[PDB]
Amino acid sequence: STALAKPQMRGLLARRLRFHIVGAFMVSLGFATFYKFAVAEKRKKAYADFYRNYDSMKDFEEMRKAGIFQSAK
């Protein structure tokens, strides 16, 4: 209501850049964590789960029964 106080007048561009480069880092950090869960670990779990109790003979017998093979009717 009285006199206006002096705002920051120097280095406004540099201040904006610093704030948003830091912000971009945080988002990158964030996204790296998302990707590890949703992609890399997801894929590691899917292969580990598939094989943990996988029965390759049983798999073959199912395929053989369906007629898929030339050499094993």
Binding site: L4, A5, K6, P7, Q8, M9, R10, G11, L12, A14
Partner: protein, 105 residues
């Protein structure tokens, strides 16, 4: 590397040179607005008085324009500047761009 205070003082001295010529006035303002800052009121004050000594009213208005422009979205800088310059604006009879309607398309 100089302090802000030593930078500002060089620029005040620059514009306060009594026989500054038109070329030096333009060189000064055109160089200053290249920096990452809005010039301190004490600098603008000296540049406006150089305009007076060079009988150049239009450049005085233009200098207020570029001060506002250099603040970008920081809307509080220009009213603070104008407040700090109002004594000089009154003494020299400088109308602001807004008072002249030069702020509307």
């Amino acid at each position: 590397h100089e302090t802000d205070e030593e930078f500002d003082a060089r620029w005040v001295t620059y514009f306060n040179k009594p026989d500054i010529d038109a070329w030096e006035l333009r060189k000064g303002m055109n160089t200053l607005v290249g920096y990452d800052l809005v010039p301190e009121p004490k600098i603008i004050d000296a540049a406006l008085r150089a305009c007076r000594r060079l009988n150049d009213f239009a450049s005085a208005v233009r200098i207020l324009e570029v001060v506002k422009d250099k603040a970008g979205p920081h809307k509080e800088i220009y009213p603070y500047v104008i407040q700090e310059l109002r004594p000089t604006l009154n003494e020299l009879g400088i109308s602001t761009p807004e008072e002249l309607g030069l702020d509307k398309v």
